Design a protein around this ligand. Structure first.
Ligand code: ADP
Ligand code: ADP
Ligand code: MG
Ligand code: MG
Lengths: 237, 237
């Protein structure tokens, strides 16, 4: 029962519309794919639906698990309603295994194990290439307080506990993932954006087949065929 | 470690080979589909793998739940090892909802509910069209004793309890299914044969989409695409 109103913002993957309710937003997932800081792009038919549906499922699982988030309800195969927040410009990354950009940064082979989950912070500024930030840099930038950063790390690790187990029970290894959080008018914080194969590195527990955006980044095959596997492992739409 | 030996029997869906172990059989699932008492047939690439993998998963779930069965271990994407039994010539059917042949028999629309699961016995004799049998007919034929029939009913309902729930947790409605049981040398009975979309009627809980052999019977689309959904809902191979 909102209704989609004027467009407020259009990013690389989704369109953000305002609704008749001031603190409710209408999110539309596009059938667009991007990689390598936007250097690689393409239209992927059906991608928006897959990510909207998967994101819906994962946020609902988080809600059931007691993890605060902005997801309100799914609206269509490609759209969903969420709580409006003012995003803290940080990409909060959790890595359970060494892979992707981290593997490249330290020169280690993907799959290298970690003693415990690693939390990394990246500046959400595409013009700057979303550079890695030391926590001290966050305070220099005044992006968040020391207590907020500590809370974000705790929140991200809580998300990891829930999702890592959820995926493992479904024969999927949650290698790493990226989260975004936002502030409410009263200063409260809620997990926001998206949680999908675009934002999570997922390997099949048996074959180690890649079922995430790496499929597009490295041209490993059909991106939607891979994402469909995840959707069904999660129980379907 | 048994090794595949001579072919003992080839049915309409699988090939049964003997192994170096007298009480162990080697089952190979074929890429063939049949319907309407063998009146409709076709080769379906990949079907054998899907049924072998799904059957493996379901028998393993049954084993975990404490339900005795002949499944030993999966051998390849299309083959599996099982305990040899002498099959009781009965197709034990459990129906949770009215559909398929039952809907046709009583002239009711598919989907009509039942107060409790219904157990039906069919004579496993394709030359006779696998006719429905009253329990009294079973005794006339001397196929099984009254105590065995009672035990088979209990066993089938126990399988329904476990599988109905397992599928429901994965957004799949187990509409009905057919089982086969066999006797060991000492008179013990084990659930045998197969448990797959070929032998189970499965509807998606949300869309009621048919994800079983009805897809082939009624030409509703790709049979393997439908079966793949079930495989992934169950956690993948
Ligand atoms: N609940 C929310 N309230 C306000 N902004 C949000 C919320 N969740 C996500 N966003 C923002 O909406 C955008 C999502 O689109 P994309 O993810 O397509 O944008 P980018 O392309 O990330 O800017 C991001 O800028 C993200 O920070
Ligand atoms: N564990 C088992 N031991 C011996 N026979 C079995 C066992 N499980 C199934 N069978 C039989 O093997 C055959 C399976 O192939 P299909 O299912 O292709 O045969 P039909 O085509 O049903 O005879 C059936 O006749 C079935 O009754
Ligand atoms: Mg984004
Ligand atoms: Mg058979």
């Amino acid at each position: 029962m909102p209704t989609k109103q004027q467009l407020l913002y259009e990013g690389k993957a989704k369109k953000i519309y305002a609704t008749d309710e001031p603190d409710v937003l209408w999110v539309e997932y596009k059938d667009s794919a991007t990689a390598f800081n936007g250097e690689k792009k393409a239209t992927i038919a059906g991608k928006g639906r897959l990510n909207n549906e998967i994101s819906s499922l994962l946020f609902l699982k988080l809600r059931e698990a007691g993890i605060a988030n902005h997801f309100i309800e799914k609206l269509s195969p490609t759209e969903q309603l969420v709580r409006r927040v003012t995003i803290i410009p940080l990409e909060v990354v959790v890595r359970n295994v060494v892979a992707g950009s981290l593997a490249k940064r330290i020169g280690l082979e993907e799959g290298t194990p970690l003693e415990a989950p690693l939390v990394e912070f990246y500046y959400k500024n595409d013009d700057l290439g979303d550079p890695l930030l030391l926590e001290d840099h966050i305070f220099i930038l005044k992006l968040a307080s020391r207590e907020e950063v500590a809370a974000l790390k705790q929140a991200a690790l809580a998300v990891n506990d829930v999702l890592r187990l959820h995926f493992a029970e479904r024969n999927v290894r949650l290698i790493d993932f990226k989260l975004e959080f936002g502030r409410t008018a009263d200063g409260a914080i809620l997990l926001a954006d998206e949680i999908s194969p675009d934002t999570c590195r997922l390997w099949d527990a048996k074959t180690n087949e890649k079922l995430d955006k790496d499929v597009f980044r490295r041209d490993l095959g059909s991106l939607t065929d891979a994402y469909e596997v995840i959707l069904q492992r999660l129980g379907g739409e």
